[PDB]
Amino acid sequence: GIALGMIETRGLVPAIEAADAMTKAAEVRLIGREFVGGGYVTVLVRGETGAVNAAVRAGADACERVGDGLVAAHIIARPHREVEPAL
C-alpha cells in the first residue's frame, strides 16, 4: 500500500511506543525514524489506507499515555510521487 502513515512526539520513548504500536496493530511497512531536533522525534510508515488508519489510531492511543505523548500525527491517503524522495 502506498498510503503513508506517520506520527511525531516529544522524546524517543513515545516514538518507540508508536513504532511498536504501528508494527503490532497493522502490518504496515516501516519506512524511517527521523530526529526533527529539539526533542521532536517522528516515524514514517507505509501501507494500505485502512491498515494505515487503524495502525495510526492505535499508535496514537498507545503513545498518548507515555512520556509527553503524541504531539502531531496525520495520514495522507494519496502521497504524491515527488514527496517520497524528500523523505
Binding site: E17, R65, V66, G67, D68, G69, V71
Partner: protein, 43 residues
C-alpha cells in the same frame, strides 16, 4: 512551548497484575526480594 505536562512513570505492560496467574499471587506481604514491591510503580 506547548504544555510540557509534567508526568512521571507508567510501567507499561508491567506483567504484575494479580489475576488467574497462579505462580504469581505470591508477593502478597511475602517474599520481600528486590523491587517487585518496593516503590510500587503507580501506573
Amino acid at each position: 512551548y506547548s504544555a510540557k505536562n509534567t508526568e512521571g512513570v507508567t510501567g507499561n505492560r508491567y506483567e504484575d497484575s494479580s489475576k488467574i496467574t497462579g505462580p504469581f499471587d505470591m508477593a502478597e506481604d511475602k517474599v520481600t526480594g528486590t523491587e517487585q514491591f518496593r516503590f510500587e510503580p503507580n501506573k
